[PDB]
Motif scaffolding. Structure first.
Motif, PDB file in Angstrom:
ATOM      1  N   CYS A 232     154.019 154.138  60.151  1.00  0.00           N
ATOM      2  CA  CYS A 232     154.111 155.160  61.231  1.00  0.00           C
ATOM      3  C   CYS A 232     152.654 154.867  62.193  1.00  0.00           C
ATOM      4  O   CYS A 232     151.553 156.701  61.348  1.00  0.00           O
TER       5      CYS A 232
ATOM      6  N   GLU B  74     158.908 161.238  54.885  1.00  0.00           N
ATOM      7  CA  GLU B  74     157.472 161.715  55.288  1.00  0.00           C
ATOM      8  C   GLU B  74     157.018 160.356  56.461  1.00  0.00           C
ATOM      9  O   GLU B  74     157.746 159.648  56.873  1.00  0.00           O
ATOM     10  N   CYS B  75     156.362 160.992  57.034  1.00  0.00           N
ATOM     11  CA  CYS B  75     155.393 159.516  57.660  1.00  0.00           C
ATOM     12  C   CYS B  75     154.521 158.628  56.524  1.00  0.00           C
ATOM     13  O   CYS B  75     153.297 159.192  57.150  1.00  0.00           O
TER      14      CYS B  75
HETATM   15 ZN    ZN Z   1     157.833 158.227  60.577  1.00  0.00          ZN
END
Ligand code: ZN
Lengths: 73, 58, 365, 405
Positions: B12, B6-7
């Motif tokens: 991110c 995932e981020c």
């Molecule tokens: Zn990411």
């Protein structure tokens, strides 16, 4: 089986399929006879369907219990 | 995506995993499960056996 | 030693010749009206009406052999606004049917249980509340007037297994519930939320609201115990403030929750110790799914036996029950009795067998 | 009584069994079997004349006006789009899923425009000259005229949408409506208040919310159930009521009380009336006497071959425009019987006599409740849209094999 509204299948006695008034339901479309071949008589015929359906064509239920989920709900 | 991950919101940043927390689905499509947003499902007698889940939307 | 003497008067048999489980009298019939009782069994339910002078007559009979149906419970009730008796039957498919003998037609069907209904009781103050213990590891309360599920007792910490049977308190404030999980967990109906839910169901209308009725899932019981019964419990009663639960240990233990001096209505939910006070002991009574019904005056408690014998108990004399009481034996008792019922006046008792062969008795009075 | 209720239950069971039997004779009697279950129960049907067959997509863009007849849940007016297998039907084509001949997946019965309605939708008659406008009948005293183009799609969770054109000429609930194919506009409605009302329509004023009745025809003693114009001549139309008279009224006759044609044509209630454009003389009419009789304009006193095949009141009749000697009828007996004229008054084998009158050619038994409406497709040869009270809309084509050689 019953080919009408599935909501009336589980209705209480004295009201199921009683046709008291309009009953709401889910949208559905059905197709089962695409195109007849208009062929000739064959003995081998005497000696699949693959119908096409769309939408919701059944009565749903609540997750918590087995209470029938109405289309309005 | 290469790492099947995932981020992380704190790492991110410009990807969309941190901006607009209280809103609809973010621009990044690798954050839907983190936000908890999913598709509505129903319950009905299955045409095969028992109960079955029928999705309301395609 | 007891001051009672019942005598067999008449008996009959059913057409379908299948085991009969649930039999209850019509306690709601006042004086003057002759006694009327019902019986269940197979896919054909039957009524009866026995007069005096040792005569038993058949009034009505029904059948539900359209599908592979079965019946277990025969709870008796009545309609307040109509004033005709109703009989509740459920099982197999789990559909609860309220038969009306006066019009000879079913009044309502209830579906939603995950398996067969095992027991049924009616709430004393309001006769329209039915205690249905379903086999799907849950218990439910039904409001007959509105045909809505008042509350679903069971959840995070409720009914780990199927609830075989449940009872009511003398005043209808506390509810007991036995089960197959070797647990005597209890759900009070005394909380303010219970009153709010009951009132809302009383003034509920499914047509008016689009949203479904908001049942109160009582996940956490107010009091539970495991140590009393080593095995599963299939019967329970409320002897005043005590508990007369019965299990497959051929005994009905008379115990009281918590310590000795603590008030029952003030017992904390965290109590984890129980004390045993009374236990009525008999033999050859180890079968499963059999129920007992005591007299309204609480002076008589009777439990059917599988061999064919009958037992009556005295529960009003000073100190708990002791001695041996007396036993009632029939000349033609060969099957297994699954339920016994007294009348409102302690003069008529009828015992059902495993062939729907009712054996009515009569006290000298 | 209890016995009456038990008999009704048995009748419903037998109706279900007969419908299950009828479903099996779909391929050997029909060209296409398309039955769609509208969410809001259908009370009327129609066939829009729009068509579009693009390259690479052999289907034809067909639109049909559905209905909405539930009690009250944000009452709507559904307009959907359907397809047609076309000449290259491709029943299997080794790739049928969409199919190889038309759309058999995704938007088979997708809804295009859903304008909210106020009450019930009795009729969905549109104007063939200008297919944008659609008129509706409601239990109130006013008619509803909508527009699937101007009105936005994707209805919000609300109701009582303003149609910007309400025709308020009736008094009680209405059940009739018909437009004029010859002249744009000129919608007439037959209601339960012993009369039929007609509106000029046509060049209706912009945002004409309040519209009065241009003309009212009160000449029938009993309740009317249908009002249909004449395809060949737009100067006359027929009014049919429960009074035993399938009257025909000529417009601009300066007489709103006495119909031009006063022949009783029946001895019982009558609830249907229609004619044929190819066969102007042919005019089928429905009745309670179960004796729907064809009549000729030149000779109406004489009784032609009364099709002795109905069993209840008939509410909807319509002859096939494309053919020459084909007529049809439907009513409370939930049967769509299609008549024929070539076999009328002619010798037949005993098996043909046992099967019924030679003039009666086709009968459709794919309904469970009372038939609400039925109509032929102007584009396709035999495709018919028939609806019932069980929220089922049926699109099917009568087999043409019988009219071979
Ligand atoms: Zn990411």
């Amino acid at each position: 089986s019953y080919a009408g509204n599935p909501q009336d299948i589980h209705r209480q006695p004295g009201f199921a399929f009683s046709r008291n008034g309009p009953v709401k339901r889910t949208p559905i479309t059905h197709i089962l006879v695409c195109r007849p071949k208009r062929t000739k008589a064959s003995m081998s015929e005497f000696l699949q369907q693959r119908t096409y359906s769309s939408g919701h064509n059944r009565l749903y239920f609540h997750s918590d219990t087995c209470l029938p989920l109405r289309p309005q709900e | 995506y290469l790492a099947v991950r995932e981020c992380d919101p704190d790492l991110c940043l410009t990807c969309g995993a941190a901006d607009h927390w209280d809103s609809k689905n973010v621009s990044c499509k690798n954050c839907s499960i983190q936000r908890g947003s999913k598709k509505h499902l129903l319950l009905a007698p299955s045409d095969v056996a028992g109960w079955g889940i029928f999705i309301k939307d395609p | 030693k007891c001051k009672y003497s019942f005598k067999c008067v008449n008996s009959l048999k059913e057409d379908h010749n299948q085991p009969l489980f649930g039999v209850q009298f019509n306690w709601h019939s006042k004086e003057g009206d002759p006694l009327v009782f019902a019986t269940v069994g197979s896919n054909r339910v039957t009524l009866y009406e026995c007069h005096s002078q040792g005569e038993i007559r058949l009034l009505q009979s029904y059948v539900d052999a359209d599908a592979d149906e079965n019946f277990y419970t025969c709870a008796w009730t009545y309609d307040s606004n109509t004033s005709h008796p109703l009989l509740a039957v459920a099982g197999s498919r789990g559909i609860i049917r309220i038969i009306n003998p006066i019009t000879m037609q079913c009044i309502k069907h209830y579906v939603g249980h995950g398996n067969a209904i095992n027991e049924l009781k009616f709430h004393p103050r309001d006769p329209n509340l039915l205690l249905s213990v379903s086999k799907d590891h849950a218990l439910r309360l039904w409001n007959i007037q509105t045909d809505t599920l008042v509350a679903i007792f069971g959840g995070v910490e409720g009914h780990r297994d199927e609830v075989l049977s449940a009872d009511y308190d003398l005043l209808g404030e506390k509810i007991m519930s036995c089960g197959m999980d070797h647990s005597l967990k209890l759900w009070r109906i005394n909380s303010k939320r219970m009153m709010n839910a009951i009132k809302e169901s009383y003034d509920y209308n499914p047509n008016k609201t689009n949203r479904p009725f908001i049942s109160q899932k009582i996940h956490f019981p107010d009091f539970s115990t495991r140590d009393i019964h080593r095995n599963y419990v299939d019967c329970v009663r409320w002897l005043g403030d005590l508990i007369l639960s019965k299990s497959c240990e051929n005994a009905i233990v008379c115990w009281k929750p918590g310590k000795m001096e603590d008030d029952i209505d003030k017992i904390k939910p965290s109590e984890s110790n129980v004390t045993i006070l009374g236990r009525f002991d008999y033999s050859q009574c180890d079968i499963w799914y059999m129920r007992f019904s005591m007299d309204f005056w609480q002076k008589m408690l009777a439990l059917g036996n599988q061999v064919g014998k009958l037992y009556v108990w005295d529960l009003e004399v000073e100190d708990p029950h002791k001695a041996k009481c007396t036993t009632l034996t029939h000349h033609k008792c060969g099957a297994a009795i699954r339920q016994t019922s007294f009348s409102r006046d302690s003069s008529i008792l009828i015992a059902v067998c495993d062939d729907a062969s009712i054996w009515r008795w009569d006290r000298l009075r | 009584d209890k016995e009456a209720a038990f008999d009704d239950a048995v009748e419903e069971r037998v109706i279900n069994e007969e419908y299950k039997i009828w479903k099996k004779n779909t391929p050997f009697l029909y060209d296409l079997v398309m039955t769609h279950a509208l969410e809001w129960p259908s009370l009327t049907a129609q066939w829009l004349p729009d068509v579009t067959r693009p390259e690479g997509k052999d289907f034809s863009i067909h639109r049909l006006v559905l209905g909405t007849h539930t009690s009250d849940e944000q009452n709507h007016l559904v307009i959907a789009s359907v397809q047609l297998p076309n000449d290259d039907a491709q029943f299997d084509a080794s790739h049928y899923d969409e199919f190889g001949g038309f759309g058999s997946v995704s938007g088979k019965i997708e809804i295009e425009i859903k304008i909210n309605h106020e009450g019930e939708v009795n009729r969905a008659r549109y104007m063939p000259q200008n297919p944008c406008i659609i008129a509706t009948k409601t239990p109130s005293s006013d008619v509803l005229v909508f527009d699937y183009t101007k009105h936005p799609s994707k209805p919000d969770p609300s109701g009582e949408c303003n149609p910007d054109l309400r025709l308020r000429g009736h008094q009680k609930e209405g059940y009739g409506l018909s437009w004029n194919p010859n002249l744009s506009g000129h919608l007439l409605s037959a209601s339960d208040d012993h009369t039929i009302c007609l509106w000029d329509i046509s060049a209706v004023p912009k945002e004409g919310k309040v519209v009065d009745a241009k003309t009212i025809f009160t000449g029938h003693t009993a309740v009317v159930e249908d009002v249909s114009w004449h395809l060949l001549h737009e100067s006359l139309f027929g009014s049919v009521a429960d009074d035993q008279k399938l009257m025909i009224w000529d417009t601009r006759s300066n007489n709103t009380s006495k119909p031009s044609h006063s022949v009783d044509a029946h001895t019982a209630e009558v609830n249907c009336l229609s004619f044929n454009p190819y066969s102007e003389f042919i005019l089928a009419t429905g009745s309670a006497d179960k004796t729907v009789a064809l009549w000729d304009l030149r000779n109406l006193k004489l009784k032609l071959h009364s099709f002795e095949s109905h069993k209840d009141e008939i509410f909807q009749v319509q002859w096939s425009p494309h053919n020459e000697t084909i007529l049809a009828s439907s009513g409370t007996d939930r049967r769509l019987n299609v008549w024929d004229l070539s076999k009328i008054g002619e010798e037949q084998s005993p098996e043909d006599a046992e099967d019924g009158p030679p003039e009666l050619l086709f009968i459709h038994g794919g309904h469970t409740a009372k038939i609400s409406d039925f109509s032929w497709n102007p584009n396709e040869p035999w495709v018919i849209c028939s609806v019932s009270e069980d929220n089922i809309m049926q699109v099917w084509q009568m087999a043409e094999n019988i009219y071979n050689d």
